[PDB]
């Protein structure tokens, strides 16, 4: 109980900032997550032995894919940590518990393929879950690991609190389906502008937690340019492999997934920042003003992609 995790000074300071990169030392990532839980939630939230066993089972159930991997899980949890720490009083005790775990678990057992590809391949998971296919699978995998012996980090919650926290985690994980992002943000936009947004309305909180989940999920666009640029390569490594698998099924993939159309990537990043990223952090900044640095960093990275197109790099 008297056993804090402490980070070296540069990490202790920079981990508080939105643009923090967790670094290339895999063995430090479990400690960074526990550090973040202890400060975000409390040193009493989780039994340390159980938490540690949970983290290591989650790590084991992330695959060695270029982007949708263990490092993404921890990266997305760090962004949630930064949002929670900058919005201290807005979130319940159960919410701070649930959301850091939801983020860590949100892409469990990802294979590096979209819901679209699962459906066109006729993958078994596409027959078990007709929409938000991989996201229903990620929640399913989270519950599985929580039910491993000595892995129930929520064991001290009442029967009804346990149900609420698993309901927080399910919605948060489903919300990382980008197909659901567009309508969720439009609805949040209308509620904020017409003045009807109400954080005591559970259905409203749900929508706001969903946008936070999209914001954390896309947070590679809020890093320093060299982090953002190299992470973009990793996601395109997945996209191009999926395009290869589409061609093997006799389907010309969309240009984004076609490795013969790499030239079109800079313009695809513009569309993505304009259609997805900027609107996401804009609405988030309206609802939670302290998250403005994510919008500022995203805008700086858009400008960097515009410079790539203009041959200024
Ligand atoms: C943040 C990061 C890694 C990025 O830097 N650059 C991307 O392009 C990207 C990212 C994450 C998830 C992405 N999903 C898509 C596909 C998509 C395109 C248009 C509309 C919806 C969905 N692109 C993604
Ligand atoms: Mg996902
Ligand atoms: Zn993700």
Curated annotation (Swiss-Prot):
The PDEase domain, residue ranges: 1-312
Species per Swiss-Prot/TrEMBL record: Homo sapiens
Domain notes: The tandem GAF domains bind cAMP, and regulate enzyme activity. The binding of cAMP stimulates enzyme activity.
Protein task: Plays a role in signal transduction by regulating the intracellular concentration of cyclic nucleotides. Can hydrolyze both cAMP and cGMP, but has higher affinity for cAMP and is more efficient with cAMP as substrate. May play a critical role in regulating cAMP and cGMP levels in the striatum, a region of the brain that contributes to the control of movement and cognition.
Expressing tissues: Abundant in the putamen and caudate nucleus regions of brain and testis, moderately expressed in the thyroid gland, pituitary gland, thalamus and cerebellum.
Designated name of the protein: cAMP and cAMP-inhibited cGMP 3',5'-cyclic phosphodiesterase 10A
Residues that bind 3',5'-cyclic GMP: 68, 269
Localization annotation: Cytoplasm, Cytosol
Binding site for a divalent metal cation 2: 107
Associated disorder: Dyskinesia, limb and orofacial, infantile-onset: An autosomal recessive, early-onset hyperkinetic movement disorder characterized by axial hypotonia, dyskinesia of the limbs and trunk, orofacial dyskinesia, drooling, and dysarthria. The severity of the hyperkinesis is variable.
Active-site residues (renumbered): 68
Residue positions binding 3',5'-cyclic AMP: 68, 269
Family: Belongs to the cyclic nucleotide phosphodiesterase family.
Quaternary organization: Homodimer.
């Amino acid at each position: 109980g008297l056993m804090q995790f402490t980070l070296p000074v540069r990490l202790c300071k920079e981990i508080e900032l939105f643009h923090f990169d967790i670094g290339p030392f895999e063995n430090m990532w479990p400690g960074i997550f526990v550090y973040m839980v202890h400060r975000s939630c409390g040193t009493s939230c989780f039994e340390l032995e159980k938490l540690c066993r949970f983290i290591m089972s989650v790590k084991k159930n992330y695959r060695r894919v270029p982007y949708h991997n263990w490092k993404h899980a921890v990266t997305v949890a760090h962004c949630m940590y930064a949002i929670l720490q900058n919005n201290h009083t807005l979130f319940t005790d159960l919410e701070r518990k649930g959301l850091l775990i939801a983020c860590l678990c949100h892409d469990l057992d990802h294979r590096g393929f979209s819901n679209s590809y699962l459906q066109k391949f006729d993958h078994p998971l596409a027959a078990l879950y007709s929409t938000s296919t991989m996201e229903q699978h990620h929640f399913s995998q989270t519950v599985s690991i929580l039910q491993l012996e000595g892995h129930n980090i929520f064991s001290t919650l009442s029967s009804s609190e346990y149900e609420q926290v698993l309901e927080i985690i399910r919605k948060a994980i489903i919300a990382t389906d980008l197909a659901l992002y567009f309508g969720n943000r439009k609805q949040l936009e209308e509620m904020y502008q017409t003045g009807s947004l109400n954080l005591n309305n559970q259905s409203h909180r749900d929508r706001v937690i969903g946008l936070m989940m999209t914001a954390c999920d896309l947070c590679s666009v809020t890093k320093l340019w060299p982090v953002t640029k190299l992470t973009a390569n990793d996601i395109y490594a997945e996209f191009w492999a999926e395009g290869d698998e589409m061609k093997k099924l006799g389907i010309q993939p969309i240009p984004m997934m076609d490795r013969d159309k790499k030239d079109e990537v800079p313009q695809g990043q513009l569309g993505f920042y304009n259609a997805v990223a900027i609107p996401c952090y804009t609405t988030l900044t309206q609802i939670l003003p302290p998250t403005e640095p994510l919008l500022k960093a995203c805008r700086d990275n858009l400008s960097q992609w515009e410079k790539v197109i203009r041959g200024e790099e």
